[PDB]
Amino acid sequence: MKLSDQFDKVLPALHKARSLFVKVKKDRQNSHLKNRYATLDSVLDAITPALMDNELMIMQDGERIDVSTLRVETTVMHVSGQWVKFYFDIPIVKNDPQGVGSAFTYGRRYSAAAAFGLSQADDDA
Amino acid sequence: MKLSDQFDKVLPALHKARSLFVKVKKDRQNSHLKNRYATLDSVLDAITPALMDNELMIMQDGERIDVSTLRVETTVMHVSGQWVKFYFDIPIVKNDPQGVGSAFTYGRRYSAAAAFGLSQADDDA
Amino acid sequence: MKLSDQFDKVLPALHKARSLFVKVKKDRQNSHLKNRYATLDSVLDAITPALMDNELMIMQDGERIDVSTLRVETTVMHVSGQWVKFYFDIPIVKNDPQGVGSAFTYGRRYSAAAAFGLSQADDDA
Amino acid sequence: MKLSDQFDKVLPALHKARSLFVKVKKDRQNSHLKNRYATLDSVLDAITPALMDNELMIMQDGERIDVSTLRVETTVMHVSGQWVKFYFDIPIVKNDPQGVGSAFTYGRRYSAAAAFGLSQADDDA
Amino acid sequence: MKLSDQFDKVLPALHKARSLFVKVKKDRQNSHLKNRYATLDSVLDAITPALMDNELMIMQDGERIDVSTLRVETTVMHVSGQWVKFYFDIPIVKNDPQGVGSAFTYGRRYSAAAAFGLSQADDDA
Amino acid sequence: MKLSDQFDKVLPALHKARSLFVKVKKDRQNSHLKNRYATLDSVLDAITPALMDNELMIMQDGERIDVSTLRVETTVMHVSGQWVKFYFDIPIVKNDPQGVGSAFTYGRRYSAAAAFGLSQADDDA
Amino acid sequence: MKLSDQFDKVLPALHKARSLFVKVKKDRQNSHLKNRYATLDSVLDAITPALMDNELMIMQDGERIDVSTLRVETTVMHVSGQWVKFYFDIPIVKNDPQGVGSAFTYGRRYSAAAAFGLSQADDDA
């Protein structure tokens, strides 16, 4: 984790998003859904709708530190320039454009979910 | 454990969460449940509901120090910028995106549970 | 991620694009489409229409750091000169002009989509 | 053992917990129970109920110094910032997420019990 | 043995515990009991009842200096911050969580008993 | 032998214990007992009853300098902080918790007995 | 032999013990006893009765300089802090707790007897 030079604007806005969030973490559980995956829903319409209202960004560098594993740097930005960086890396298997692309999205889901409290356990197949 | 430069705001708020917490640790045990796992419930609706009310965050970096084991850095933040870092690492078996993802959530559960007193023994299968 | 010397103009304009965006991320999901690929639509008529209205650019260097993998540097520019750089690399297979060209576009889609929140999971074939 | 810079607040509060404690150590022994294990009860409803009333915390880092053995750092915090660190490590057998998780809880029980006087001998199976 | 910077408060309180102690060492021997083990009774209800009344603590670090033997640091604390450290180590046999746990309690019994005069010979099986 | 910085209080009190002692050394021999062992009686009710009355302590570190032999540091403390250290080591045979425990008590008996004049020859089986 | 910093109190008291001693050395020989061993009597009721009356101590460190031989440091103390150290070492045979214990007492008898004039020849079996 790398905090920016200042944290007096991004943090208060980030909390305001939490108190208004309707994400799968809270105010969404029901007796119908049993296994939640949301490979795309975790950011498609889950956190982005309120994050943007709170003058925040969702944006993810995909630098590859090593060939074996692809590093993912999930970051959230504020207009004032403050940010907080989350790191998480995912291994590659087939080492071709199709494989790395499918691994990049998986790493994105884990990093963003962990940085915002979303479980995304997906223990079962 | 890495304390921040100051601790005079995050700590008092953290305690206030404990006195109001209704987590599985206290005020929840009954004569019906016998084995508690809460692979997702430990943070889904257990601690987050009161932590956010106490101006706190739940957020978890997933840096991999070594290929053999994935390091998990569970952190709780305050608006004022104070924080307390918890470290815990979980080994990898199959070293592919599916395996590392399922190991990351397991490490998250152990780190957060230990940092907040939740047993999460899960001795039995 | 490499921020420029100043960030007080590009960032506010970037957010204004998000609040007015009609991208596939939001205000576009329906009950007809099930699997979204948008190999060309992600930038053809999805983000560019509003980005240009907000005095921004979409422009992508294709430097090859190593023969094994082609590096893609996706950048967004403002008239004032501020910018934010996104990095992402994609491996090459056949190492001929046809193969590298098809890999370059794939890397472009992943980098831009991740830097703007678009899922672009494309898990299925 | 690592004492903090100051000890004039955490210690007096810690003793007040002891004089009011109703833990298995005292004021709990009976003629019915013969073998006490409390794999979860040692912290579930045994010490936490009074520790929190005395403005204290129960929180446990799980750093792994070496692959062979997992180190456990059991700590108790006060609002004023004072703390006292207890160290205890537990060996690993199967070196997979399931095994390390079950070893972590065992090490937690031994460290906390010893730091608070609880026997937790568990000599028999 | 490591004495603290000052010893003018912990020592007088420690003696007051001895003069009021009803431990198995004195004022407890009878003509019925012949072999005394007190694997748990040595601290369960033997010394703790009076030690706490004399503003003292019983608390035991379990650091492992070497894999072969587990070191036990039995310490008694006072509110004023003074302390006296007792060292004693116990070898490990099976080098797994079950074995080390049962060895830790055995080492605790020997260290505390010797530091307070309790025989705990247990020569016979 | 390691004397403390001062010896003007512990020594006079130590002698007063000798003049009032009713230990097996003196004022106890009879025509009935022939072979004296007192594996536990040497400190159980022999010297402790008068030592505590003379503001003294009986307390024994069990540091292991080497695996072959276990070192025993028998010490007697005064409220004023003065002390006198006695050293004596006992070899280990089976190098397991049961063996070391039974050797520790044997070394304790020899060290304390020699430091107080008690014979404890135990030449016969 | 190691004399203390001062010798103007312990020595005069030591002589006074000799002039009043009724040890086997003098004022005890008869025509009945022929072979004198006093494995325990040499200190049990022979010298201690008068030594304590002369404000002296009998106390014996058992440090082991080498595994082959056990060193015995027989010392006599005065309230004023003066002392005189006698050294004598005894070899070990079986190198187990039983053997070393029986050798320690033998070395104690030789050192004390020689430092006080007692013959303790024990030439015959």
Is the Cβ pair D120, E105 closer than 8 Å? yes
Dig out the tokens for A66 from the structure.
């090593």
Instruction: Answer positive or negative: Cα dihedral of B113, B114, B115, B116.
Output: positive
> Diameter of chain F by CA atoms?
45
Q: Do E29 and F39 touch (CB under 8 A)?
A: no
Question: Would you call A40 and C119 a contact, using CB atoms and an 8 Å cutoff?
Answer: yes
- One-letter amino acid for residue F68 of the chain: S
Alpha helices in D37-78, H assignment, sequence order: 41-44, 48-53
- B105, two tokens: 């959530």
Give me F114's structure tokens: 């020699």
* CA separation for the pair D40, B34 (Å, rounded): 11
Q: Which of A80, A81, A100 sits opposite C90 (nearest CB)?
A: A100
E49: nearest CA partner in chain D? D26
DSSP string for residues in B32-60? S------TTHHHHSSSHHHHHHTTB--EE
Contact F88 G45 (CB under 8 A): no
> Cβ separation of E63 and D88 shorter than 8 Å?
yes
First to last CA, chain A: 31
Cβ-contact F79, E15 below 8 angstroms: yes
Residue F77 Cα, gap to closest chain E Cα (Å): 9
Contact residues for F82 (Cβ-Cβ < 8 A; gap 6+): F4, F5, F6, F7, F8, F9, F10, F11
Whether B and C touch (3+ CB pairs < 8 Å), yes or no: no
First to last CA, chain E: 31
Residue type, position F33, single letter: L
List the structure tokens of G59.
Answer: 């106390």
Q: Across the interface, which of E3, E29, E93 has its CB nearest the CB of F45?
A: E29
Nearest to A122 among B44, B78, B101 (CB): B101
CA distance B5 to B78: 13
Inspect the interface and report whether the beta carbons of B58 and A1 lie closer than 8 Å.
Answer: no
Among candidate residues D37, E25, G106, G122, the one with its CA nearest the CA of residue F46:
E25
Q: What is the 3-state secondary structure (H, E, C) of chain G?
A: CEECCCCCCHHHHHHHHHHHCCCCCCCCCCCCCCCCCCCCHHHHCCCHHHHHHCCECCEEEECCCCCCEEEEEEEEEECCCCEEEEEEEEECCCCCHHHHHHHHHHHHHHHHHHHHCCCCCCCCC
Nearest by Cα to B104 from G21, A121, G88, F31: A121
Cβ contacts of B25 on chain D, cutoff 8 Å: 43-44, 48
Instruction: List CB contacts (< 8 A) between D79 and chain B.
Output: 11-12, 15
Residues 6+ apart with CB under 8 A from D113: D42, D119, D120
3-class secondary-structure state, position F41: helix
Q: Let me know how long chain E is.
A: 125
Q: Which of B55, B67, B95 sits opposite A15 (nearest CB)?
A: B55
Q: Do the chains C and E touch each other, judged by at least 3 C-beta pairs below 8 angstroms?
A: no
Task: Select the residue from C29, C33, C119, C123 to test the A interface by mutation, using most A Cβ atoms within 10 A.
Answer: C119
Decide if D57 and B15 are in contact by the 8 Å CB cutoff: yes
Phi-psi region of G95 (alpha: psi -120 to 50; beta: other; left: phi over 0): left
Q: How was this structure determined?
A: cryo-EM
Q: 3-class SS at C103?
A: helix
* HSE-up of residue F57 (Cα within 13 Å, Cβ side): 28
- Residues E107, E63: Cα–Cα separation, whole Å: 12
* Minimum distance, in Å, between the CA of residue D79 and any CA atom of chain E: 17
Closest CA to B50 of B18, B9, B95: B18
Ranges of H-type helices in E23-96? 41-44, 48-53
Kindly give the pairing relationship between strand A2-3 and strand E2-3: unpaired
List chain B residues with CB under 8 Å of A25: 43-44, 48
Shortest alpha-carbon distance between residue B31 and chain A (Å): 23
User: Residue C36 CA to chain centroid, in angstroms?
Assistant: 16
Nearest CA distance, D31 vs chain B (angstrom): 23
E54: CB partners within 8 A, 6+ apart: E13, E14, E16, E17, E20
Closest CA to F3 of G6, E15, G82, G104: G82
